[PDB]
Structures are given as C-alpha cells and as structure tokens.
Amino acid sequence: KIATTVGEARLSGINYRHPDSALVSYPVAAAAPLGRLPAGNYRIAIVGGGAGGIAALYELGRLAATLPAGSGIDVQIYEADPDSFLHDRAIKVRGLKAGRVSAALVHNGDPASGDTIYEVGAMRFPEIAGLTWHYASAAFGDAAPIKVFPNPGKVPTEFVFGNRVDRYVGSDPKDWEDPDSPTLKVLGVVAGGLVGNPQGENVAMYPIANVDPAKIAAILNAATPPADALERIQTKYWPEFIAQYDGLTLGAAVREIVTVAFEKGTLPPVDGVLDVDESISYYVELFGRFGFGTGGFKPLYNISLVEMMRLILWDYSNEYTLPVTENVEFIRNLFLKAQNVGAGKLVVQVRQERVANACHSGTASARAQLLSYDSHNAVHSEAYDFVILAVPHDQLTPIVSRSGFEHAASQNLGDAGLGLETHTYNQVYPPLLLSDSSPAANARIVTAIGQLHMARSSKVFATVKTAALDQPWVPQWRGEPIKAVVSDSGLAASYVVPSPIVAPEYSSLLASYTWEDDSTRLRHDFGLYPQNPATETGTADGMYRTMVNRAYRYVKYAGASNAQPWWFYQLLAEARTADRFVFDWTTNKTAGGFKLDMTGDHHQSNLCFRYHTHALAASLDNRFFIASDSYSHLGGWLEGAFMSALNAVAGLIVRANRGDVSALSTEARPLVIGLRPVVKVPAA
Amino acid sequence: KIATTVGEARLSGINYRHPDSALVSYPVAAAAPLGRLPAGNYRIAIVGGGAGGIAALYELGRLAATLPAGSGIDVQIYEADPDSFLHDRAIKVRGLKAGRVSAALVHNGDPASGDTIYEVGAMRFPEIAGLTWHYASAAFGDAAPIKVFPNPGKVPTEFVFGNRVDRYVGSDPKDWEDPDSPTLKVLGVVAGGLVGNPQGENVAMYPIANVDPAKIAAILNAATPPADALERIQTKYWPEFIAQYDGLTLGAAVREIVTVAFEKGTLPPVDGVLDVDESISYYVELFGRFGFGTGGFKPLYNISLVEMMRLILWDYSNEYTLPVTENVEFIRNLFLKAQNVGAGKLVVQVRQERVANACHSGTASARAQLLSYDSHNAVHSEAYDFVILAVPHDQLTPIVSRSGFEHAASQNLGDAGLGLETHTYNQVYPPLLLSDSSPAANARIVTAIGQLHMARSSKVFATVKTAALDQPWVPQWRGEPIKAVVSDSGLAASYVVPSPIVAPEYSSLLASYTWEDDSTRLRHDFGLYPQNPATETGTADGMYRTMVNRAYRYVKYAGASNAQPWWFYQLLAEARTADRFVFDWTTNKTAGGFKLDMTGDHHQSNLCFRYHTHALAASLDNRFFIASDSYSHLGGWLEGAFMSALNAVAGLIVRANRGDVSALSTEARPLVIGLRPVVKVPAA
Ligand SMILES: Cc1cc2nc3c(=O)[nH]c(=O)nc-3n(C[C@H](O)[C@H](O)[C@H](O)COP(=O)(O)OP(=O)(O)OC[C@H]3O[C@@H](n4cnc5c(N)ncnc54)[C@H](O)[C@@H]3O)c2cc1C
Ligand SMILES: Cc1cc2nc3c(=O)[nH]c(=O)nc-3n(C[C@H](O)[C@H](O)[C@H](O)COP(=O)(O)OP(=O)(O)OC[C@H]3O[C@@H](n4cnc5c(N)ncnc54)[C@H](O)[C@@H]3O)c2cc1C
Ligand code: MET
Ligand code: MET
C-alpha cells in the first residue's frame, strides 16, 4: 500500500486533521486562495526565506492574483543566511539552503558533476503530511515519483543496545533474525500500550475519548466524520487528554506501560536474573534505543506524552522522499511558483539583511516597522502594512522582546551592544500586540516564545562507495546489505543513503544523526561550529575519527564464540578521507534543530499556534503574524512550518479586512474560527 | 544562626542523611578510617584527579596509615587535564583546575598580584553539605572563616520576567519594593506546596510518609532520630515517594500546585484579560524564572520531582564560600593531606595520561587493566589490584563500554578509530563486572552510565571595578547596590562578586550563569569552545558584546514613566575590555556541567550509586569502583562526588577482604549494607 507518486501521498493525507486543529483539514483549506483582500497596493514584509516564509509568499501570490486592476502586493523578503538559495539567483553549501532544508553537495571541482548530497536538515516526509504533499504537488506535480525513506526497519537494519543485537526488517517476526527477540516483544507491548487497536477491545493505557488512540486517528483521517465528533475532539476530548497528560513525559509513560506488562507476565525477567526493577528498567531503555520507526526515542523521552501522541495519531514514521536531487529544490520551486501565480500582481524583492527589531510605531498608514542590518552592518529601517515573522523562536526572541510590553513615547532600537547603529522610533508599541491595555498579554506571548524548547540535533556525514556495502563483513538480510544501524554506541542512528545524483557509485554515509543528549554527548568532538569543515575544501577528519572510534566496540553475535570489533567500525572507516562533515544545528543561529514540547509546554506552543487569531480583534490593529514550525504542533516537520504559514496568511487576510472572517473562503475560515481566540477582549 | 567558620558549617550538617542513604550520615562514617585491609602491598589506580578521585585518595591514605610494617598502598593517579593542579607541582587557568573545581586568574602580567578570580565551576556550598565541610576541615581547619554566598535574595537583587520587575532582599515582604508582588505570592504558593510546614498541619502537595517534606528533613538531620525512622524512610517511605513521583517533572509539579492555588483564589487572574490556563501558565513561568534561592529553575523543569525533593530536604540554597582565594585550593590541600595522613605507607605517582580502556584480564594477581595514552599519544598498559574510576559518566563511557559484556578470548583495546596503538588483552572480562553469568547484568550498569543526563552549563565572566556599583545609574536597595540579577533576557543569572584577592578594587562580573536550554540558546555566540579566549592574552570581546546586547532591552519600572534601556546593560558595558571570558562545560570533555536526573533516571543513577555493593559477592572477581557526582544523588555538588568516593573506598575494603563486611568500621558498614545490593548474596 506504498505510495509511489506525489499525488498518491497527497491524496492519502488530504483529510487528516491534527488534534489541536481538528475542525480543519489544512490541505482542504489550501486548495483555493485563502480569501480576499480589499483593493489596494499593499507593502508586506516576510522575515525569513525558509519553508514558512516561502509558503506564506506563495499564498500571498495566490491572493495577489485575485486583486483587481490597479491593485497589487509588494513583498520584501529578508533573508540573513548568506547560503540561502535566495541569494544565488569539496563540499558546497552556498545557494543550497532554505533555512533548515539544507543540502551539502559533495564534488571534486565541478559542482554540476557531484558525487552525493548530504541532507543536513529535513529529509523524510510522512505519507499523511497532507499540506507538505499539497505544496509538493504545486512544486512538482502529482505524477512526480517518490521513494520510501530508508528508515530503520524499512531497509535491513542492525540494532544494538547493551548486550542485545537484532537484525530485522519491519515488525513481522518472520523478518527478524531472532523471531523470539525481546526487542520485538517490548515493541509490541509499548505500541499496544500507546497506540492500541483500531478495532475491537481497547488495550491502550492512555485513552482519548475513552478509546484507543488508533480509533481516534481513524476519525481524524476520515474520508467523511461526524462534524460532531471532530468538535468534541477539538473542544472536549483532546483538551481533556492534555489536562491529564501534559505533565507526563514519554519516558514516564513507557515505564508505566512496561511495569504493567511485566506485572502481568507479558514481559519476562531479563536473563532470567535481573530483579523486577532492573528488568523493567532494561526494557524501558531497550525500547528507548529501538524506537517507533525512526530510531531510538530515548533522547526524546522528556517530551510530553501529548507531543508523542500527536505523532502516533499521524502515523508519523511512514515516510517518503521528495522528487529531487536536493530537498532545497522544493523550496526554490515554491518561491518561483509564488511569483508565477501572482500573475504580475505580486512583486518580490530579496534583502540580504538580518532583522534586529520589529515594532509598531508612528502615525502613518504603514506602522509595522523592521530594523535590519546588511552584510556590512549598515542599518536599515522600513515600514510595512503587514509583516510575517517567519523565523523560529530563538531567532524571533531578539526581534520581539527588547521593546517592552506597552506604549513608549520613543525608543532607540537596534543592536547597541554590538556597537551597531540604533534607530529612533516614536509612539512605539510591541510587534506581537495582543493588547492596547494589558502589558501582561503582550508579555505572555513574548515570554512563551522565548521559553519554547528547541531540540538539539547534529548530523555527521561522509562519502562512501556504495560497493563498500558488498564487503564480506557487511551483514546481509535475504541477500540485501544492512543500510540502517540504530545503536547505543553514541552514534544513535546511522544511514547509508544512495546518492541521489544518478545504482550510484557513492552513498551519503549519515554516520550519526543525533537528538538532545545524544547530540550533547558528541558536541565536544566537532572541532568547528556549526560546520566542520567551515570551508568548501576542508575535511572534518579528526572529528570523524572520533565517531569511527565510538564504533570500535567488541560486539557479540549469537552463536559466535567470541566478540570482534563491530563491523560497522569497518564500514565507517571505508568512507573516503575528503568530505568528512558535521553540522551542529545546536550551534547554528537557530540554537537547535526544531521545537519539541516538554511537559507543560503545550500552553506555550498552543498560544503561538493560535496567535494569528488576534486578527479577530478589530480595533487592536496588530500587523504582525508568525510563521514557523516553532509556532505549530508539528515542530520538526515541514508540515508544522506550512501550517503556521497558512495560519499567518489567514490571519493577515482577516486583519486586512478589519476583523471580518467572511473574507476568508468557506474552506479556510476554520483556520481562524476553529481555534480558541487569543484575545478574549475584545470579542469577534 | 549564620555559620561563620568551617567548623560551624561542619557541625551544622554532621548528622544529615540523604533519603537514598538514610541509614547513614556520611560525615559520621568518615570520622575514622573506613575499615581495615589485610597486610599486603596494594597497587591501586585512581582515574581522575577531581574531587572524587582526591577524596578517594585521602581515604586510602587513612587506610594506609593503619597497615603494618612492610605493607603499603601505591596509587597511580591518572589525570588527562593539562591544566590540573596535579601537573603544576590576562587570564591564567594552568594549574588552577581540579576537574570541575576550576579557577581562572585575572592578572596584568604578574600572576602573583592578580585582580580577581572567576570560579568557572563549583562556587557555592550548602550549610548542610556535611561531607564537604568535613573535608574542608581536613584541608583548612575548623577555625577558617567562611562567608554567605551572595545568591539572589542574599544581597539586593533585581528580578525580571516579562513585564514583571522586582527588587528585593530576603523573603520578608517588608524588604520587597512591592510587598504585593505576584512573585512573592507565587513563591509562597510553591513553597507551601512543595516544602510545607515543619510543625503543625501538613499542607504540602507531595507528602513523604504522609507528612510534609519539611518534617522529614528534620528527622534526616536529627542527631538521634526515633528508633526505626531512618530504616522506614530508607526501605519504605522514600521508595514509595519515588514509585509515585519519579515520573513527574518539576515543571509539572509546579503547574499542579499553581492550578490548585488558582482554583482556590489564592492566585488571581493575571489580567483583566488572561484566561485560566494563560494565568496559570504565567504564574508557572514567573516562578520558573524566580527560583528557590539560586536563580530560576525553569531551565531545570524537566528534572524529576524526586531530584528536586532531594534538594528541598537538604535546604540546598543556604550556601557559603570556602576559606580560599580559589576553590581549587581545597582539592590541592586535600591531595597534600592525603599524602600526609598516609604516614609514609601511601605512595602516589601522577600520570599525565588519558585512560582509554579498563578491563579485567589475564591470570596474574593484579588483573584490573588500564590502557592509557600520554601527551605524545604513546600507549601504556598497567595492571592493578583495584581501580577507582573517578570520572563523570560521559568520560567513563568509552573506558567501560567498548569491551562487550562477557568473557572474550582476546581483545585489541584502545583508540583504534583515532589511529592510536592498541594493546592485546587475553581472557578478558568487562571492567564493571556485575555477573559471571549474565551479559544483561553487565549491560545494565554500562547502559545506565551512558544514559545519565549531564546538564548543560556555561559561565560568561568579565572584570569590573567594584566602584561601578556606586554609580547613580546602579540601583540601590536597602542600603546597598544590586549585586544579583535574575532575568529572562537570556543571561539567566548574573552576579557581581567581589574579588577574593584582597574592599577589593575589582569584582568578577558573572554576567551569565546558565543551565540547560538557557545555555543552549547562547552557545552559538561563544566563538571558541570550550573556552574563549583559548589563550592567556586574548579577550572574548565579540562574544561578550552579544551578551551586553541581550541586555539592551527597554525596561519599564514603576519609578519612571519613560522606559529606558535596562541599567544592567550599562553595568555590563562597564566591564573592562580585557579579560572578557566564557567557559562552556557542554563543549568541555565532560559533555556538560553535572548530572541532573530526568523522570525515570532514578533507576539508572541509583544503580550507579549502589554499584559498590558488588563487593558483597565474594565469588565475583570485580576490582573496579566508581567515584563521581555522576554516581550519586547529588549531581552538581561536591557532596555527591565525595559521597561516591566514600562508597568506592568502602566497597574496595569489602572486596579486598573477600566479601567480609566486618572489615568496615561500625560506622562505615552501612555505606555498603544500608543499600539494596546490586548482586544477590545470602542474608547475614
Ligand atoms: C536536523 C533536522 C532534521 C529535520 N528532519 C525533518 C524531516 O525529515 N522532515 C520534515 O518534514 N522536517 C524535518 N525538519 C524540520 C524542517 O526542516 C523545518 O520544520 C522547516 O524547514 C522550518 O522552516 P521554518 O520556516 O519554520 O524555519 P527555518 O527553516 O529556520 O527558516 C527561517 C529562515 O529565516 C532566516 N532568518 C532567521 N532569523 C532572521 C533574521 N533575524 N533576519 C533575517 N532572516 C532571518 C533564516 O536564515 C532561515 O532561512 C528537520 C530539521 C532539522 C534541522
Ligand atoms: C558549572 C558548574 C557549577 C557547579 N556548581 C557547584 C557549586 O556551586 N557547589 C558544589 O558543591 N558543586 C558545584 N559543582 C559540582 C562540582 O564541581 C562537582 O560535583 C565536582 O567537582 C565533580 O568532581 P568529580 O570528581 O565527580 O568529577 P570531575 O571534577 O569531572 O573530575 C574528573 C577528573 O578526571 C579527569 N579525567 C576525565 N577523564 C579522564 C580520562 N579518561 N583519563 C584521565 N583523566 C581523566 C578530568 O580531567 C578531571 O580532572 C559545579 C560544577 C560545574 C561544572
Ligand atoms: C520531530 S521528530 C525528529 C525530527 C525529524 N522530523 C525527523 O524525523 O528526524
Ligand atoms: C545542581 S544545582 C546546579 C549546580 C550547582 N550546584 C549550583 O548551585 O549552581
């Protein structure tokens, strides 16, 4: 039941509604332009040219094409990253980034004839990521081919935790080297306890609406559900799940599930010899390293159960590639499509400038101010009708948090501590303006943004001949070499990905893709930050040798007399010397890879997700919207950035229409009215 | 009531027992040598010359002095840090480190006449840290003066969160600028809920033995508790607390407490406009930035409630300085005292070598093997009777996890991925040998160690004239300048500490002391890792300007209508150009600052804490002990390192006596027998 084209994936997920936005299918809302604007010549800024900002630009283009003769939209897009595709009309990165969609091209002097691509950020896309595939269809067409991402379990995989080794494909014991594996048994216990059954008895530990999550996922994905059922999920049942479980970590939930299974006898004592608590702990940690289909979630054990449950409902692990050589092409293509679809009514200019501050000021028609610095640190100020702040939360904080929380007669804004020039604004209000009369409302949005959790992440890459997989010491599953390795060696998750520039001579050896503490533990060895090599011609050889050295472990396989050094050490050492690489998102200006919510974080992230509803408060007249995966319930997915972009543009339309929701299309209106408003007073 | 000398502190905490070791006061155990050894000439290694390793050395010296004529102990102490005090027998660090006890001396060319000291690691010591003050008396005498550490609230303090500003000293509202402050109300709610009352009614939300923690704290600190009370805590009531609450984060607990208080009306809606969950979240986040006496615990919100409760029971925030110019002096003095107390029966040699591997091997008497590399990267192998591994968990992992989990005929150990020379060992068993028959048992200890959580931390320092505090632009409160700033600016916690080289002309401006995500958010700006400057003659000016710039915020105060840039911006910018500094523990080889347990981590950390009980199994030939704050229930405190060292030496005594617990002193026996054993052996 594997999808083979963009269109097949698109249609698969077209219906799916996430539990915090259960009254709308975002793909359906995005099918037609989101609404209508009054006649005018608008001046809009988008800060950030990543997935969020470019999707927002695309939707603005669609709106622009609907405007009457004499009307139009001008967009200034600010993009600070010198490597952005926006500024481009051995390891090469220049022109190959669109924020956290980021490719590194490995070549030997001629970039048009490369060896492989490292996908440094986004790489694998859920089947039911309906908005993702909607935009992929706009970019590439429905007919374009897609492939199954080679996740652990999708290709032959070796798993190592402590003394346990497994070699497997999927979850059918017939496809496991050891069909009696305790790993496969604990997977069944934890999946049963978290997901349960779509039919029959409820067996999950943490019900939603008194039933297993699998049953709720089928309603959220229904090709037609009760409207009433969706409303009750939105307003009652998902909120009640949050109230109960937002304070429970994933790690705690796994331990509860394993404890009950152990007490029932479904899981036996480990070795026959560990005591009760040691056995439970062993299983918790074993599952921790194994995961849900994308490698161990041990490093993610501090996320709320609520956050994990979003991913469960979404069947997140069932993922595909894009029909591209480099994922940045998706975003580049959407940028071009935006301009095409505006039909001449959208004009776009790119600024290679870092925004330092946003505010509302003055008494002119355009009051939405941006203060920015160019690549030689010259200051620039511009006023706009509307602004979309399409940057993740730690990048947004300095822009929105340094102006205070209420009216100020005058402020000299900018990066004065850097020695840079400031600019005087008069009659100043915060950019994220939730009240004329509460500094606390203005402070709540800013403080929430600034305390969202950016998960840490890093990727270590090298280039290897694909034929290295045919060495006699590389294990096989039914004649196919092992191509994914999930391990407690410190590397966490490793992938031998065939080059997309093509059977390819080379593969991208994703030696280590780490999250959270797994990333922290490596970071001292990266050498140069955020990228080693920092130059096009260097190689991160010393760093990479420390990764090879982590793999230099004696591994015992069942039936063998003695342990020998792990074969995967030999595989890593087969990578060529040149083009060894690490990128540390943690030491990038993003301050990490992507948002993941901790216990208690729902209320912070959800405030951000609902922020665009400020447009309902007509007199407030707030001109700023936010658009990033940080302002979604899908941090770490293009789907989240795209949802947030859709929210931002929907809100912008309502604000341009002075609070009138009838300006949104029928299908888009629930983007605004299906959420609890962020402004209680005034109503609207 | 305030302790004024080492002896007064020592005596204050002499009886205190931690809840995971409730049967024993470690200082009482340590009052005499821990036990006796058979006659012999012992060859022992200590890996690591930090607080754990040196306290272990001291206790081995105490033991050595008791040996008869012709007997003795030889210790090889391995210390890889080139800046260790052990290898020394503008910003200078050479010779000023004892692991995470780490000083930076600021001077102008003559290091004998410095300006100030930056305490880069340990700096503030709880009054009831009884073992810390026990060793401080060994090093300095009881008469040595100590000072109250200038924590937020101990000195005039400014607190900033969102739109909220407070200026205060203490918890008496008479000395808050706003006695009606919401910050003081939430603090009182969160204290009632977590700590409760030492007398009368129980009001706390999370009881221990059905009573408030404050009541249990008193029992744990009592010279003579009631009969059976400590046993019941140890075996019943504290285990039951863990079973209930080890799956609950601190942040979740705070929100539960706040929710109940908001529903009761103790905490009002924040604005005329914040809804229920918004007001609740505001108070949770307000308290999160304020803290318990040492700055905001928001970054620590993912710790288990169990871990916070340990700190509550210990009154952890009531802290002092040591009687030194640099805290490294404490560890240096202890090292010299170890040699003195050995009475010529302890011989110590220091090796400037990095240990790469430990194992048991061969057939000779001394079977505990260490493989190391010197400063020329030449390999060394040495065999010992016993080894104490006195390094934190991420540094221990490569040493103990790469030899598998059962017998191997031979292994070529070492850092082969680095291209370094290996050494062949024959008849090899893992170093952390919990079982002769169960790889899973051996895997549980290794995998536990490798998955402990090392909290991230960083410190930004500069040098400022103390007289800067007397400028009209620095606020005064209750007769003194503000000297502590706790803020949501990104800096987290800031201190203006008078120089200890002396009123002093200079102060150490600890501009930012961050934990966890607060540290992550800054890390991209550090420039050089782990230390900027990397040289003695440089200054981290560019880095520091990014911190000054985070302080360039317009702050509205009650006392002035026109908000201005935060005064603290001016103070930070008053620091001199030279000697600006950051140290990032996260990018140090420790991979962070210190252990803090997440939900579920009790089972891992407590396994480590109990590991030395392997000595009870006489048939098990395990020569290795561990000694670090990572293997304690006080990660982030010298007390934890010292407790773990006491455990290690107690276990070593029992192992050297082939399982005979009677070889421990009466007072030290419970260090082994008061814990659940990690190996099953017969009763009594
Ligand atoms: C390691 C990693 C793995 C991932 N895995 C997947 C995956 O497999 N599948 C998936 O769907 N998603 C994945 N993601 C998530 C995906 O990459 C993001 O959700 C998405 O790219 C974020 O888009 P955004 O617009 O929110 O932010 P960003 O991509 O961060 O874009 C923001 C843009 O704003 C610019 N900018 C920032 N601050 C300023 C400023 N002050 N002035 C001007 N310009 C500024 C930046 O330079 C950047 O181009 C992954 C990401 C990472 C890092
Ligand atoms: C930012 C920070 C703040 C802190 N605040 C306080 C505080 O105010 N009060 C308090 O009581 N405590 C505090 N602590 C905690 C205190 O510093 C530690 O508990 C204690 O110093 C840890 O001692 P240790 O022996 O466990 O480990 P370490 O200090 O880490 O010492 C281990 C030693 O082993 C060496 N080593 C490591 N690996 C090898 C190897 N392979 N071969 C050879 N040598 C090796 C290291 O170089 C090091 O010298 C703080 C620590 C930090 C970092
Ligand atoms: C949020 S899940 C982790 C990040 C990313 N979506 C991945 O699959 O790697
Ligand atoms: C564990 S609490 C945090 C580290 C250290 N004890 C401090 O007081 O800063």
Short mmCIF file of N, CA and C in Angstrom, two decimals, chain A residues 112-189:
data_model
loop_
_atom_site.label_atom_id
_atom_site.label_comp_id
_atom_site.label_asym_id
_atom_site.label_seq_id
_atom_site.Cartn_x
_atom_site.Cartn_y
_atom_site.Cartn_z
N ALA A 112 28.51 20.81 -10.95
CA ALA A 112 27.48 20.24 -11.85
C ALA A 112 27.68 18.73 -12.04
N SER A 113 28.79 18.15 -11.52
CA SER A 113 29.06 16.71 -11.66
C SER A 113 29.45 16.14 -10.30
N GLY A 114 28.53 16.22 -9.35
CA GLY A 114 28.84 15.84 -7.99
C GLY A 114 28.75 14.35 -7.72
N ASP A 115 29.22 14.02 -6.53
CA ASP A 115 29.22 12.64 -6.09
C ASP A 115 27.96 12.29 -5.30
N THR A 116 27.60 13.12 -4.32
CA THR A 116 26.42 12.86 -3.48
C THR A 116 25.97 14.18 -2.88
N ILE A 117 24.84 14.11 -2.18
CA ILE A 117 24.26 15.22 -1.43
C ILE A 117 24.11 14.73 0.01
N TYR A 118 24.48 15.55 0.97
CA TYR A 118 24.13 15.37 2.36
C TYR A 118 22.88 16.19 2.64
N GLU A 119 21.81 15.57 3.12
CA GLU A 119 20.61 16.28 3.56
C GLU A 119 20.83 16.61 5.03
N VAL A 120 21.22 17.86 5.28
CA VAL A 120 21.67 18.27 6.58
C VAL A 120 20.53 18.53 7.54
N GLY A 121 19.36 18.91 7.03
CA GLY A 121 18.14 19.15 7.80
C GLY A 121 17.03 18.21 7.39
N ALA A 122 15.93 18.74 6.91
CA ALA A 122 14.79 17.89 6.60
C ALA A 122 15.17 16.85 5.59
N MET A 123 14.63 15.63 5.75
CA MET A 123 14.92 14.52 4.84
C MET A 123 13.85 13.51 4.63
N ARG A 124 12.84 13.38 5.50
CA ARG A 124 11.91 12.28 5.39
C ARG A 124 10.51 12.80 5.75
N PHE A 125 9.52 12.44 4.91
CA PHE A 125 8.24 13.16 4.91
C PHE A 125 7.09 12.17 5.08
N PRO A 126 6.33 12.31 6.18
CA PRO A 126 5.24 11.34 6.46
C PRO A 126 4.26 11.27 5.28
N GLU A 127 3.73 10.06 5.04
CA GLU A 127 2.71 9.90 3.99
C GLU A 127 1.53 10.82 4.21
N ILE A 128 1.11 10.93 5.45
CA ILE A 128 -0.11 11.71 5.76
C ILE A 128 0.15 13.16 6.10
N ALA A 129 1.37 13.66 5.75
CA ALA A 129 1.72 15.09 5.82
C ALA A 129 1.02 15.78 4.68
N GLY A 130 -0.29 16.00 4.81
CA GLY A 130 -1.08 16.40 3.68
C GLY A 130 -0.73 17.76 3.12
N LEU A 131 -0.38 18.73 3.97
CA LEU A 131 -0.01 20.05 3.46
C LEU A 131 1.33 20.05 2.77
N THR A 132 2.27 19.24 3.30
CA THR A 132 3.54 19.02 2.70
C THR A 132 3.40 18.54 1.27
N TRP A 133 2.56 17.50 1.10
CA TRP A 133 2.34 16.93 -0.23
C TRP A 133 1.51 17.83 -1.12
N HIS A 134 0.61 18.63 -0.58
CA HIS A 134 -0.08 19.65 -1.32
C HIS A 134 0.89 20.60 -1.97
N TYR A 135 1.84 21.10 -1.18
CA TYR A 135 2.85 22.00 -1.73
C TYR A 135 3.83 21.28 -2.63
N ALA A 136 4.15 20.00 -2.33
CA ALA A 136 4.98 19.25 -3.24
C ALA A 136 4.34 19.09 -4.58
N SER A 137 3.00 18.94 -4.63
CA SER A 137 2.29 18.87 -5.87
C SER A 137 2.34 20.20 -6.61
N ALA A 138 2.18 21.33 -5.91
CA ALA A 138 2.31 22.63 -6.55
C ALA A 138 3.70 22.80 -7.19
N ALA A 139 4.71 22.31 -6.50
CA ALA A 139 6.10 22.43 -6.95
C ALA A 139 6.42 21.44 -8.08
N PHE A 140 5.99 20.21 -8.02
CA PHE A 140 6.49 19.16 -8.87
C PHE A 140 5.46 18.39 -9.69
N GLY A 141 4.20 18.57 -9.38
CA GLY A 141 3.10 17.84 -9.99
C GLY A 141 2.81 16.53 -9.30
N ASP A 142 1.56 16.09 -9.41
CA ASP A 142 1.13 14.85 -8.81
C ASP A 142 1.88 13.61 -9.34
N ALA A 143 2.27 13.65 -10.62
CA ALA A 143 2.88 12.48 -11.26
C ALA A 143 4.30 12.22 -10.76
N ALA A 144 4.94 13.14 -10.09
CA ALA A 144 6.37 13.01 -9.78
C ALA A 144 6.59 11.84 -8.82
N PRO A 145 7.63 11.01 -9.06
CA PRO A 145 7.85 9.79 -8.27
C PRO A 145 8.46 10.10 -6.93
N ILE A 146 8.07 9.31 -5.94
CA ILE A 146 8.63 9.35 -4.58
C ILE A 146 9.07 7.95 -4.20
N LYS A 147 9.98 7.88 -3.23
CA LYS A 147 10.54 6.65 -2.70
C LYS A 147 10.29 6.53 -1.22
N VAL A 148 10.25 5.32 -0.69
CA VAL A 148 10.18 5.07 0.76
C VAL A 148 11.48 5.52 1.36
N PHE A 149 11.45 6.37 2.39
CA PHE A 149 12.70 6.77 3.05
C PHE A 149 13.31 5.52 3.73
N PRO A 150 14.60 5.28 3.62
CA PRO A 150 15.21 4.06 4.14
C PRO A 150 15.47 4.12 5.66
N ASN A 151 14.39 4.23 6.41
CA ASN A 151 14.39 4.22 7.88
C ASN A 151 14.81 2.90 8.42
N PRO A 152 15.26 2.87 9.67
CA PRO A 152 15.40 1.56 10.37
C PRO A 152 14.10 0.81 10.29
N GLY A 153 14.17 -0.43 9.92
CA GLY A 153 13.00 -1.25 9.68
C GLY A 153 12.45 -1.23 8.28
N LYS A 154 12.69 -0.18 7.49
CA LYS A 154 12.25 -0.14 6.10
C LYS A 154 13.25 -0.80 5.20
N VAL A 155 14.52 -0.79 5.52
CA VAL A 155 15.59 -1.47 4.88
C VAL A 155 16.17 -2.39 5.95
N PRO A 156 17.03 -3.36 5.55
CA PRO A 156 17.66 -4.21 6.58
C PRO A 156 18.42 -3.36 7.52
N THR A 157 18.20 -3.65 8.83
CA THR A 157 18.66 -2.84 9.93
C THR A 157 19.36 -3.69 10.99
N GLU A 158 20.46 -3.16 11.53
CA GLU A 158 21.06 -3.71 12.74
C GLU A 158 20.78 -2.75 13.90
N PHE A 159 20.32 -3.35 14.99
CA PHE A 159 20.02 -2.67 16.25
C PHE A 159 20.93 -3.23 17.35
N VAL A 160 21.55 -2.32 18.11
CA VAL A 160 22.41 -2.70 19.21
C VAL A 160 22.06 -1.83 20.42
N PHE A 161 21.74 -2.48 21.54
CA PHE A 161 21.53 -1.85 22.85
C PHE A 161 22.15 -2.74 23.86
N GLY A 162 23.14 -2.28 24.62
CA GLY A 162 23.74 -3.14 25.62
C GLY A 162 24.22 -4.42 24.95
N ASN A 163 23.86 -5.55 25.57
CA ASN A 163 24.19 -6.86 25.09
C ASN A 163 23.29 -7.36 23.97
N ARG A 164 22.24 -6.65 23.64
CA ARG A 164 21.29 -7.13 22.67
C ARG A 164 21.59 -6.67 21.26
N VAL A 165 21.56 -7.56 20.31
CA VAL A 165 21.67 -7.28 18.89
C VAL A 165 20.45 -7.86 18.19
N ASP A 166 19.95 -7.12 17.23
CA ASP A 166 18.92 -7.61 16.32
C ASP A 166 19.23 -7.20 14.89
N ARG A 167 18.80 -8.00 13.95
CA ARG A 167 18.85 -7.68 12.53
C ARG A 167 17.46 -7.95 11.97
N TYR A 168 16.85 -6.98 11.29
CA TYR A 168 15.43 -7.04 11.00
C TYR A 168 15.02 -6.16 9.86
N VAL A 169 13.83 -6.44 9.36
CA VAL A 169 13.01 -5.59 8.52
C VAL A 169 11.60 -5.61 9.10
N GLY A 170 10.98 -4.46 9.26
CA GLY A 170 9.59 -4.37 9.71
C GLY A 170 9.36 -4.99 11.08
N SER A 171 8.13 -5.43 11.32
CA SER A 171 7.69 -5.90 12.62
C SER A 171 7.15 -7.33 12.57
N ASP A 172 7.21 -7.99 11.43
CA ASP A 172 6.77 -9.38 11.38
C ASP A 172 7.90 -10.22 11.83
N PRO A 173 7.72 -11.08 12.83
CA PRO A 173 8.81 -11.89 13.35
C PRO A 173 9.49 -12.75 12.29
N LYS A 174 8.78 -13.12 11.21
CA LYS A 174 9.37 -13.86 10.13
C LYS A 174 10.54 -13.13 9.45
N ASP A 175 10.55 -11.82 9.61
CA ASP A 175 11.54 -10.93 9.00
C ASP A 175 12.61 -10.49 9.96
N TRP A 176 12.61 -11.02 11.16
CA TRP A 176 13.63 -10.80 12.20
C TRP A 176 14.58 -11.98 12.25
N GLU A 177 15.90 -11.76 12.39
CA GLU A 177 16.82 -12.86 12.52
C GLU A 177 16.50 -13.72 13.73
N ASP A 178 16.09 -13.09 14.82
CA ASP A 178 15.62 -13.74 16.02
C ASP A 178 14.13 -13.43 16.19
N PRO A 179 13.25 -14.37 15.74
CA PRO A 179 11.83 -14.07 15.85
C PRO A 179 11.32 -14.01 17.30
N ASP A 180 12.09 -14.53 18.24
CA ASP A 180 11.76 -14.52 19.65
C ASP A 180 12.39 -13.35 20.37
N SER A 181 12.89 -12.36 19.61
CA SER A 181 13.65 -11.28 20.17
C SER A 181 12.85 -10.57 21.28
N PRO A 182 13.50 -10.25 22.39
CA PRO A 182 12.87 -9.39 23.39
C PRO A 182 12.60 -7.99 22.87
N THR A 183 13.38 -7.53 21.91
CA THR A 183 13.19 -6.20 21.33
C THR A 183 11.83 -6.13 20.64
N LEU A 184 11.53 -7.15 19.85
CA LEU A 184 10.28 -7.16 19.13
C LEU A 184 9.15 -7.31 20.17
N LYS A 185 9.34 -8.06 21.25
CA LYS A 185 8.34 -8.20 22.26
C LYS A 185 8.05 -6.89 22.97
N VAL A 186 9.08 -6.15 23.36
CA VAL A 186 8.87 -4.88 24.03
C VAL A 186 8.23 -3.88 23.08
N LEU A 187 8.59 -3.89 21.81
CA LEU A 187 7.93 -3.05 20.86
C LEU A 187 6.40 -3.30 20.86
N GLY A 188 6.00 -4.55 20.80
CA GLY A 188 4.61 -4.86 20.82
C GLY A 188 3.89 -4.39 22.08
N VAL A 189 4.53 -4.50 23.23
CA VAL A 189 3.98 -4.04 24.49
C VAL A 189 3.83 -2.54 24.47
#
